[PDB]
Ligand binder design. Structure first.
Ligand SMILES: *[C@@H]1O[C@H](CO)[C@@H](O[C@@H]2O[C@H](CO)[C@@H](O[C@@H]3O[C@H](CO)[C@@H](O)[C@H](O)[C@@H]3O)[C@H](O)[C@H]2NC(C)=O)[C@H](O)[C@H]1NC(C)=O
Length: 164
């Protein structure tokens, strides 16, 4: 009876140039459920029109987020966003958002409380502040946006469980 939905979207840059498209891994109760990219979604009369629309839009957002990182244009870099929601046995919820730069976690938000966790190193702190500025100023994200992110995730989790 405890359930979880986990989205993992990755975008890449080469010599500072952000690559076309994206790659999303979705997990339902810990089991790999979908691989999605620019072209289509495929599981692991099959139609994924909701996921293709929503994940493409997120892909677009994260690509602009990576472009706004004032780091370096030498080699491969990756920005990776994880979105998680859980329904616990006692009907309570957890939900969070996590950013990874070149495999290292550097920023998290708890979507139940809207509090952010900043990293230890100054290098990671620079990345966190860059991203948080982009989200607040350029993307114009507000409390309602993050409340809505929680709700959307939970509603999707409930939708998938309702079918199978
Ligand atoms: C989010 O999903 C991505 C994939 O879409 C996960 O990355 C993939 O998983 C592992 C670990 O990062 C990689 O495989 C392992 O590392 C090397 C690659 O250098 C590989 O040669 C080994 O065979 C080993 O199994 C895999 O290559 C990697 N794929 C990509 C495209 O990066 C990632 O772990 C997920 N992140 C989170 C935070 O859940």
């Amino acid at each position: 009876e405890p359930h979880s939905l986990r989205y993992n979207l990755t975008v890449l840059s080469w010599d500072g140039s952000v690559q076309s498209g994206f790659l999303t891994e979705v997990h339902l109760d810990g089991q790999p459920f979908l691989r999605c990219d620019r072209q289509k979604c495929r599981a692991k009369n099959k139609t994924w029109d909701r996921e293709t629309r929503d994940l493409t839009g997120w892909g677009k957002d994260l690509r602009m987020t990576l472009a706004h990182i004032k780091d370096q244009k030498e080699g491969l870099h990756s920005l990776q966003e994880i979105r998680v929601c859980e329904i616990h046995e006692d009907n309570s919820t957890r939900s969070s958002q996590h950013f990874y730069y070149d495999g290292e976690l550097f920023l998290s938000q708890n979507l139940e409380t809207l509090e952010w966790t900043m990293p230890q190193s100054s290098r990671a702190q620079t990345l966190a502040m860059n991203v948080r500025n982009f989200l607040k100023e350029d993307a114009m994200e507000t409390d309602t946006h993050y409340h809505a992110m929680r709700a959307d995730c939970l509603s999707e989790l409930r939708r998938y469980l309702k079918s199978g």
